[PDB]
Ligand binder design. Structure first.
Ligand code: NAI
Ligand code: FMN
Ligand code: SF4
Ligand code: SF4
Ligand code: SF4
Ligand code: FES
Ligand code: FES
Ligand code: K
Lengths: 430, 230, 44, 213
């Protein structure tokens, strides 16, 4: 199979994504949820891990780490401490709104994924860390958890399998840095949401010092479907090491901004022109696309023609898949102002613990503000490139890389526009 | 023996398990620069000055917190270690105030010394610096928080040794500040050691203020007789 | 009857300020006892 | 926007504050959600509950949280100052937050911001003289495909136009709470031009199950 896309409705994991059916237990149970869960819980942890790692599922958070190895890191005998599965439902990355849909419309899929994942690695409980702004989504999740508890699906003797498992929901307080896994762990513990240093990895020391595995909502909600349908069915879609389906949020200067599930190796042009109704003013009006939210470098129109939205082909286009959040900017957009707003967002959302991000991101914010005004010189463009290279790779967490990358992409693909801006400011203001 | 073998600049050294990169480099006489690491405090790892390069590894690691495994080669004077040191020094000196003649840490400042030794020689900062509101924590310690580098030795000392838990960090991003958030006097029996462990002139001795300079003082090693500890 | 022309997530229009908290308080009976670290607090 | 506290008659440590008994039971449930020996992990939800009861956080809820959780007050001060959802100043009854991040900026959110500004007669960061509205500008809120959008307290108002946000403000001034949803033709996140996916009925239980399970 060389061409990918045009996924049928029978192969979609996230049915009732748009909320057109019942989100409660009665409607979810008629859609295949909570079916034969006792069999998966009784087939052992290693069988679940083998089913996960045969499908080749990679982490949907944005790092793209393989899920089977990451989950099997906690398949070790316990030393008296409990083990915890922690679900990252923060979703603070701009352009990304898939986890809100998953929580709001399919909560029982998330609960079943929590139970199956906790059985796969011997977790004592589950801690769902939802965004603090998602009050209604958190209340819907609490209602569904109550319905699952009252039906005997979780709790003491969960699903009649002899396994004890609790699901908890913890609400955040409005911090984008708390989406980082170690910062999430620190925020659950009642501290400031500042990330830790690795090693120790969360499988060794995590929440409360216990072994902990932090997993995304999307990579958890698909696990019962993986164990039920099979790993080969999930691996039948996408390329090598890019298996399965993916939720895309198409937004920006597009006709129909929407969230839609699609095959992993779908072309970007086909995805945009099919699901979102095309960009405004036709395909020739496209100017730039950010494929993975604000943490990924942007690509111009000449690259989006022949690119595929998986991990490897987007890596080879010197960008990343990210969270599969496609932000589209047409020719009526100031690209410098958009990237400056992104850097301003990164300056506002930065924990300030470690030196290079804390100083340098504000430095880049000031430099890009002067770039938007045009009050600079090309020597400052090369200086900003060097500063971005100095920030990246020298920080505790990956927010510094996520703030360095968009500037590098903007410089690399739109240096003539910036130079024209500063030269017209110099010739107008003097 | 449980000792493992590592290499510092190609020189073999036997280290105990649990040893950090910094202590292994200290075992052969190399002192990696630090701003937040203290040997009598917990490891924070936020100043990022100790970023050293391990060979056959495409990422610099924080030497104050990274444990060494066997077969590792540490390059303390390679090109990218020096590049990381220069970048971190530039970021530290980006927002620092130009207060060296009017500051008591001059001549004994760690920031001055390992900016001269490991940093660059000029500034590319073409913006305006920040200013932080000063605080009052007692008649003993003079506080000028514009000079603070957010090294968080304050909180680690006051929580792990003095056991007071009055100092902390309030804010986020570049607006993050070190303080008590209220008009509280940090009055303990071990308060001047926060003057001692501050690497910059942010916390100074108020009785000693504006009196001498460190290069002109003659040092005599003696014994305290104020109590029976000796 | 298959209906996909209506929005079935209309329950959140009647949620109050305390709904999450009373949901947690009612859920508190089903939950299992928590593990203990042996001391009241790390500062103890 | 100051991260230091100065004593005022309105905000002093002697300002009266205490939880209601039902809130004490809720605090007990929150504490029971956590392992023993780690009672300090409940600093965030109890502080949020105090803000929900009071509407803002003076320095009497912080000390009360430190007292009922046996944690130092400095840690509660750090928690309150780090996160942006906690209000250390008294905001109005309706706290309007307008997202101006780039995916919302591309869909003309500044038009919504100036519409609110000329409807209320204030600017960003200010409060109406009758203490009913507060207008601030925030980062992304996880509704980027429904841009432009605002958040009023717990509710999300999405796909807004200047006329729609003016209608929301006028209805809020009358005392009636609007429906927290997109004001366009779509319901939650579907494409406006019909359903391009999930148009079939779901297959149901036992569909595609592998053998041996
Ligand atoms: N989803 C979102 O909202 C956002 C996603 N991102 C993306 O997230 C990524 C950065 O996130 P991180 O988790 O910090 O980076 P990633 O490099 O570290 O790590 C992913 C996971 O693999 C584990 N891991 C990796 N190597 C390991 C090893 N040798 N031993 C044990 N565990 C190991 C880590 O513990 C972590 O849980 C980037 O790709 C960025 O684009 C960035 C911003 C927002
Ligand atoms: C600044 C920052 C913010 C992040 N925010 C989120 C987030 O909101 N949701 C998420 O799932 N992962 C987020 N991540 C990625 C996590 O660190 C981690 O990779 C993820 O929670 C779990 O990865 P997985 O997809 O393999 O399970 C963030 C990372 C960083 C550096
Ligand atoms: S890179 Fe920024 S957000 Fe991440 S740990 Fe450092 S200061 Fe915090
Ligand atoms: S603390 Fe050091 S670098 Fe800063 S003003 Fe004083 S002597 Fe100069
Ligand atoms: S005042 Fe000094 S010791 Fe305290 S955090 Fe700042 S630099 Fe470190
Ligand atoms: S000495 Fe290691 S990061 Fe500061
Ligand atoms: S960018 Fe505005 S909700 Fe995400
Ligand atoms: K000092």
């Amino acid at each position: 199979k060389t061409s990918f896309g045009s996924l049928k409705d029978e192969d979609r994991i996230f049915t009732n994504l748009y909320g057109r059916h019942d989100w409660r237990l009665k409607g979810a149970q008629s859609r295949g949820d909570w079916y034969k869960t006792k069999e998966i819980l009784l087939k052992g942890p290693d069988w679940i891990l083998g089913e996960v790692k045969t499908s080749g599922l990679r982490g949907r958070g944005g790092a793209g780490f393989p899920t089977g190895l990451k989950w099997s890191f906690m398949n070790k005998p316990s030393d008296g401490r409990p083990k915890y599965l922690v679900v990252n439902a923060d979703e603070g990355e701009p352009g990304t709104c898939k986890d809100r849909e998953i929580i709001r419309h399919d909560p029982h899929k998330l609960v079943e994924g929590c139970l199956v994942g906790g059985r796969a690695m011997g977790a004592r409980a589950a801690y769902i860390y939802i965004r603090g702004e998602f009050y209604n989504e958190a209340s819907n999740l609490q209602v569904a958890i109550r319905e699952a508890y009252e039906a005997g699906l979780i709790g003491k003797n969960a699903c009649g399998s002899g396994y004890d498992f609790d699901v908890f929901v913890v609400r955040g307080a409005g911090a984008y840095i708390c989406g980082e896994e170690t910062a999430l762990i620190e925020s659950i513990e009642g501290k400031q949401g500042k990330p830790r240093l690795k090693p120790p990895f969360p499988a060794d020391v995590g929440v409360f010092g216990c072994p902990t595995t932090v997993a995304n909502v999307e990579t958890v909600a698909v696990s019962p479907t993986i164990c039920r349908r099979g790993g080969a069915w999930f691996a039948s879609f996408g390329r090598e090491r890019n298996s399965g389906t993916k939720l895309f949020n198409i937004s920006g200067h597009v006709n129909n901004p929407c969230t839609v599930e699609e095959e992993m190796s779908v072309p970007l042009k086909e995805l945009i022109e099919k699901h979102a109704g095309g960009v405004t003013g036709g395909w020739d009006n496209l100017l730039a696309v950010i494929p993975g939210g604000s943490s990924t470098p942007l690509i111009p129109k000449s690259v989006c023609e022949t690119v595929l939205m998986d991990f490897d082909a987007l890596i080879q286009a010197q960008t990343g898949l990210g969270t599969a959040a496609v932000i589209v900017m047409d020719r009526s957009t100031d690209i410098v102002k958009a990237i400056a707003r992104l850097i301003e967002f990164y300056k506002h959302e930065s924990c300030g613990q470690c030196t290079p991000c804390r100083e340098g991101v504000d430095w880049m914010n000031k430099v890009m503000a002067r770039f938007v005004r045009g009050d600079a010189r090309p020597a400052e463009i090369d200086s900003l490139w060097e500063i971005s290279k100095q920030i990246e790779g020298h920080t505790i967490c990956a927010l510094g890389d996520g703030a360095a990358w968009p500037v590098q992409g903007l410089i690399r693909h739109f240096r003539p526009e910036l130079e024209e801006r500063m030269q017209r400011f110099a010739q107008q203001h003097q | 023996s449980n000792l493992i073998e590592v290499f510092v600049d190609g020189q073999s050294v036997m280290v105990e398990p649990g040893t950090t990169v910094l202590q292994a480099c200290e075992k052969v006489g190399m002192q990696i620069p630090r701003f937040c690491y203290h040997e009598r405090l917990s490891v924070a790892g936020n100043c990022r000055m100790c970023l050293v390069e391990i060979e056959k590894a495409p990422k610099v690691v924080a030497a104050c917190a990274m444990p060494v495994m066997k077969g590792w080669n540490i390059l303390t004077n390679s090109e990218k270690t020096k590049k990381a040191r220069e970048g971190v020094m530039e970021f530290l000196l980006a927002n620092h105030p130009l207060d060296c003649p009017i500051c008591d840490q001059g001549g004994e400042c760690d920031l001055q010394d390992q900016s001269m030794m490991f940093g660059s020689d000029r500034s590319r900062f073409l913006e305006g610096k920040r200013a932080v509101e000063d605080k009052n924590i007692g008649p003993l310690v003079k506080t000028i928080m514009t000079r603070c580098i957010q090294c968080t030795r304050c909180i680690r000392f006051a929580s792990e040794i003095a056991g007071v838990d009055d100092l902390g960090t309030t804010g986020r991003g570049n607006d993050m500040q070190v303080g008590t958030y209220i008009e509280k006097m940090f009055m303990s029996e071990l308060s001047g050691n926060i003057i001692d462990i501050c690497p910059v002139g942010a916390l100074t001795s108020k009785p000693y203020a504006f009196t001498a300079r460190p290069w002109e003082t003659r040092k005599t090693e003696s014994i305290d007789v104020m109590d029976a500890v000796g | 009857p298959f209906d996909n022309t209506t929005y079935k997530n209309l329950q959140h229009h009647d949620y109050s300020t305390y709904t999450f908290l009373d949901l947690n308080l009612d859920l508190s009976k089903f939950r299992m006892p928590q593990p203990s670290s042996g001391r009241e607090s790390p500062r103890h | 926007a100051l991260f230091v506290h100065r004593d005022t008659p309105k905000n002093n440590p002697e300002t009266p504050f205490d939880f209601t008994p039902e809130n004490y039971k809720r605090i007990e449930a929150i504490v029971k959600n956590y392992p023993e020996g780690h009672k300090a992990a409940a600093v965030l939800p109890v502080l949020d509950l105090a803000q929900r009861q009071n509407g803002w956080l003076p320095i009497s809820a912080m000390n009360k949280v430190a007292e009922i959780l046996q944690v130092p007050p400095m840690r509660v001060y750090e928690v309150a100052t780090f996160y942006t959802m906690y209000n250390r100043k008294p905001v109005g009854k309706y706290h309007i937050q307008v997202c101006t991040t780039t995916p919302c900026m591309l869909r003309n959110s500044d038009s919504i911001l100036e519409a609110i500004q000329k409807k209320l007669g204030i600017k960003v960061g200010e409060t109406t003289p009758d203490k009913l509205f507060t207008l601030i500008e925030v980062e992304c809120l996880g509704a980027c495909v429904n841009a432009p959008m605002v958040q009023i307290n717990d509710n999300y108002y999405e796909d807004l136009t200047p006329k729609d946000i003016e209608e929301i403000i006028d209805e809020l001034k009358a005392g009636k709470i609007p429906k927290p949803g997109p004001r366009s033709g779509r319901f939650s996140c579907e494409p406006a031009g019909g359903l391009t996916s999930l148009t079939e009925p779901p297959k149901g239980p036992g569909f595609g199950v592998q053998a041996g399970l």
